[PDB]
Design a protein around this ligand. Structure first.
Ligand code: A1AJN
Lengths: 156, 39
């Protein structure tokens, strides 16, 4: 299958037509997405098969073919880019200054950008092009707008 | 069977559209991975 580094759409033929359920990042031979996109199921890449390797429902992350490889972090000061890949639409970079999610276990960066559900798994990047996390697990605030955490895994 | 399709390179784009605000929110994360607002 296609193992080239880059951003990919995650598709299913189980529903009506071909529906985009999410997005992911192929880096160093490992496919990275959010758990709620695949529910831990196997994936197809052309005629090849990608098997889950690691996953955690609470972090809402999953890696295929190998361990989680993404370890860059938001520096807490700079603007970032959401490389949004919406269903049926071309990949587009959106620059923003992240807000913060304050939790009892520490603070997390957050991006206030609203996209369709099938955009979950789109990468958030720093100025060096490094993936600092994935978009798609967050909350809906008073004004009905969406705010996603910048969700990053641990590179063992 | 879910399948993947390439959508692009992962690179910073100079002159990308700049938008979105930066809210500071108190949140809670449950065992199911769901975030909720704390008030
Ligand atoms: N803005 C639509 C929603 C979403 C979920 C994940 C990623 C992006 N958008 C669908 C559920 C409520 C928020």
């Amino acid at each position: 299958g296609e193992t080239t580094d880059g951003v990919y759409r995650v598709m299913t033929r189980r529903l009506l037509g071909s529906t985009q359920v999410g997005v992911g990042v192929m880096q160093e031979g490992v496919f990275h997405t959010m758990w709620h996109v695949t529910k831990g199921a196997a994936l197809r890449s052309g005629e090849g098969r990608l098997d889950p390797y690691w996953g955690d429902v609470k972090q809402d992350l999953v890696s295929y073919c190998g361990p989680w490889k993404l370890d860059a972090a938001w520096d807490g000061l700079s603007e970032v880019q959401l490389l949004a890949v919406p269903p049926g639409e071309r990949a587009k970079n959106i620059q923003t200054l992240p807000g913060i999610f304050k939790t009892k276990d520490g603070d997390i960066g957050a991006v206030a950008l609203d996209y369709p559900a099938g955009t979950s798994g789109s990468p958030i990047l720093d100025k060096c092009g490094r993936v600092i996390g994935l978009y798609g697990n967050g909350v809906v605030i008073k004004n009905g707008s969406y705010v996603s955490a910048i969700t990053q895994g641990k590179r063992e | 069977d879910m399948y993947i399709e390439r959508a692009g390179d992962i690179t910073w784009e100079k002159d990308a559209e700049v938008t979105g605000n930066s809210p500071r929110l108190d949140v809670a994360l449950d065992e199911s991975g769901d975030f909720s607002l704390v008030e």
